Symmetry: C5
């Protein structure tokens, strides 16, 4: 009965990811919703992962009620960052419309390493927390419309 979410986390900063993962798990537990957790090389692999789960569920696998996307992108000195942030947000959003699914977007786009934690921890910004609530919020509507 209680929604079972699939948390897809992209981690390069074990410390940071742990903050978001905790943040997301926090809000989810308080809401009393079960969940699994898979790990991917980067934010860009999050969409495909969700896509894998949907395909699996269509083959009798776990039929998730919603998904939470966690990851951290910091704009360093290389150009391989602005692209990740944009395209990940784009893919996730399209996937959400295309597959008519609930997806909490916790892919944080931070400038420096500092803001990464400000937004990471659940005590401060708790962006991982909002992601879960967003997910559940979306799961709620998804249910409401009986999609």
């Amino acid at each position: 009965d209680a929604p079972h979410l699939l948390i897809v986390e992209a981690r390069f900063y074990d410390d940071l990811a742990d903050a978001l993962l905790d943040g997301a798990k926090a809000a989810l537990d308080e809401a009393g919703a079960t969940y699994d957790v898979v790990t991917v090389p980067g934010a860009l692999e999050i969409p495909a992962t969700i896509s894998f789960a949907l395909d699996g569920a269509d083959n009798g696998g776990t039929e998730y009620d919603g998904f939470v996307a966690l990851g951290t992108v910091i704009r360093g000195e290389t150009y391989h960052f602005d692209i990740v942030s944009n395209e990940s947000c784009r893919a996730l959003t399209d996937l959400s419309v295309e597959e008519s699914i609930a997806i909490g977007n916790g892919i944080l786009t931070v400038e420096n390493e500092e803001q990464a934690w400000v937004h990471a921890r659940r005590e401060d910004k708790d962006k991982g927390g909002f992601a879960a609530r967003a997910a559940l919020t979306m799961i709620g509507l998804r249910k409401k419309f009986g999609a």
Copy 2:
């Protein structure tokens, strides 16, 4: 009479009301009915409409059009610009893809001040214009027999 679905994203309850007020007014004045749901951000509006569309395919509410409302001010963080482009993009695509009437009332201003100059139905009434856009599209959608 057209039954619209108003999907709003709200972070600043206040600003969101000026917009929902505008949208609701415009729809009321045109004699259109509607339901209202809420989402945490502009980016979730596309998916919400998607749900409604799927839901209607399974005996759910058969909406005639949609009204998207939200506010995205460019502050300092980068999690603003991207939200603005994608929301607009996803909404536009959704409308073409599903061939549906969508009133785009997602505001993209530079500051809190410009937000109300667009929100309040006393000013630019962006919410009202969005609702009217929706109605316009619904009318076009019918005229063509889509």
Copy 3:
């Protein structure tokens, strides 16, 4: 027998829109093509409008040979303009590919009122006319390939 296209115009500035429309109409008349005209609030609603026409044609509705999209986007003070410029273009481009249809893109993106007129007027740059001519060229290619 002669090409019949659907002019979809987004009109905020009534005068500018009349100028573009005059341009589009003059070019279409000159080639011997016919057309219907529908109005929408903004450039962003043109792709869907065309989408409506295509659907309606699949239901015994009007069968257009091509489309002309007319609109005027003036980079004002608000940031809500560069978005309309990009997406309208991208949305139209995709639609033309996705649906293999002839679309003259006459959505102007100008810096101000002055350039709007410089571009909208048939007497000057005639973008409405060029968009119509582009639609006609595309219809020609479309017929040539037998699509």
Copy 4:
């Protein structure tokens, strides 16, 4: 038996376009491939044209083995150059994946007339020849995977 490609050229600057087309045609000649040439007014019209060709093939029309897209965008005064550059590239790439086709991308995006010649001329950068060759390369990979 030799590859037969369709060259879709966006033609605005006649001389540059001729250089470009000369580069492509020469590259296709040297490899023994044949080609048809169609003209559109802008780069944004190339993807759809290719779309028509594909639709026509299904309708008993000419079956092409690959496509060469030629065009020249020079960042000038209008803001309708950054959009054309990105969206045409995006549209073509998207089209190549979606339809699994061989497309040589010779749409040039240069800062000025001088660089346009440096790139367009077969005797220099020969971007037209590169695109025609890129197209033949993709046709080769296409046959290789038996697609």
Copy 5:
């Protein structure tokens, strides 16, 4: 064992060799096999993978995953950010659209020096990471039973 298709876009033969080397090493180390095909630019990579997928359908090689390699060095012109943007965009979509495992090894650096820092396996081993990324995605793809 997994059989991958490495699609490399190569202009700078030296950098390409680095990435390829790094990718092959990471795949052999995991016991995965692979075929290598070469394209002119990063933008042809998505379509190449598309050809593979297509060919599989006709009794052609069935790949369990793909590794895309290329290096886009932002020069003095802006026609590098386009290639960089659209290739990353196209691969991400193909991975979602076809639900396949794709290791993104397309490098987007500021200068040549950085390319080598990312290309060399002794360094940031981006080629190896893309290959590893692909394996991970293959594992996950298996886990969910995609």
